[PDB]
Symmetry: C2
Subunit: 254 residues, 2 copies
């Protein structure tokens, strides 16, 4: 389906922006893997913004790995707005008692009280839930998020779970719930040069292209000869492209 071929592009690395922070540990493992394989398995998923720029909506650690590896162009799949919806990740913290970062950040005005306002953050254990609202918050919405997420993210052990999935907690777990953003909030965040915390925005994307395996060597120089090479490479790959429209379980290795 050539409609997909036309959305696979090599974009100058300096024209791509993040809307979120990244976790440098995951960045370094992903980067090791790319350097070892000398391939980028999946294109980074981007949307057009303004000034001829692009915003990553999925693959921030791949993109950062390529930038850190000295790539001048990034293989992207350009996603239309009709192809995605915006949800969020909840952060499940196993053995959440031994997680010293959040373990006594008492000062924020957590409360079990529920009001018809929107609870910005919700903290869960097997028994109880706690909330945060800007009626009580002194600083702005997003640095609360940075503070809270960052208190446990890099120090404690986290597993991200989709905000829409069904999950029940053990008594070891703590579950951090963050409400999804609208695209206009994300756009404003990027336009102001800001970022949301790592690993909280979750884009549900239809029509992902998988297992492109872009050779790293193609990404090192920005020369339009390199672009002819990219078109050749891509034409070779599309012949092996098959569309799947039902749930699949993909082994991402070989």
């Amino acid at each position: 389906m050539k409609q997909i071929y036309d959305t696979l592009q090599l974009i100058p690395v300096d024209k791509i922006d993040l809307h979120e922070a990244f976790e440098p540990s995951r960045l370094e493992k992903t980067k090791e893997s790319i350097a070892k394989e000398q391939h980028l398995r999946h294109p980074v998923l981007v949307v057009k913004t303004l000034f001829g720029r692009y915003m990553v909506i999925d693959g921030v650690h791949r993109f950062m790995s390529l930038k850190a590896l000295g790539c001048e162009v990034i293989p992207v799949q350009v996603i239309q707005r009709t192809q995605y919806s915006i949800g969020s990740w909840h952060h499940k913290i196993p053995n959440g008692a031994w997680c010293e970062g959040l373990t006594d950040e008492e000062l924020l005005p957590w409360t079990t009280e529920v009001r018809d306002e929107t609870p910005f953050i919700t903290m869960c254990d097997q028994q109880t839930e706690h909330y945060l609202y800007v009626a009580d918050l002194t600083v702005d919405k997003l640095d609360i998020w940075k503070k809270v997420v960052n208190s446990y993210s890099a120090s404690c052990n986290v597993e991200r779970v989709p905000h829409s999935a069904c999950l029940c907690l053990d008594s070891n777990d703590i579950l951090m719930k963050y409400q999804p953003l609208q695209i206009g909030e994300i756009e404003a965040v990027v336009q102001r040069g800001q970022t949301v915390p790592a690993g909280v925005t979750r884009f549900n994307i239809a029509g992902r292209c998988l297992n492109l395996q872009v050779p790293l060597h193609l990404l090192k120089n920005s020369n339009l000869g390199n672009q002819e090479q990219w078109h050749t490479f891509l034409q070779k790959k599309i012949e092996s492209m098959r569309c799947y429209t039902e749930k699949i379980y993909l082994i991402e290795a070989e």
Copy 2:
């Protein structure tokens, strides 16, 4: 879901049955490819039947290729009835008026009469339909499906379209419409040692496991001591497994 692990099994080759004819042209390219790669990319998709036997619902040519190569066990994924629905393929013949194999067959009792019985086969064009009913035909549904399908399968160009899909016939198209069978019927067929013609049944399966890349070395000797290797193999592959719930475009190459 870790249930996948229990559904991926090595099954003796003599316990597996096909329900549909295979196209040997396609069988030879599948066989070729498997021999070159020394691996089976996707597991054969089967459902359990009677006498501890299994019926292939997708992967006829992978299976036949494996049997031709001397494999004693087939890597399969056991699909449960909640995972799949059964539809059919319609066969669109562009410029069907010039399909000689379909026109010279003046014998068959094609008819525009709409009866209360369901027709074996419906042959449509832009503004008129023809049917074949049991009452006008001396021999069984399957013999007629194979006779009609083979009158144009190799003779003329044919686009296979899902029966539920949207299709508007151009001025010169002809459309062969076949009934979707129920699983009881397909099972009866296999129980009598018969097969449906190729390219007519269409299984819509959710949760296909993809890109397992089973090494061929594991399929030649069917001994309990092989199973350990298998299980080892499997547990390794699962650690690279990922579920995709939206439509994907997978590059099935490396």
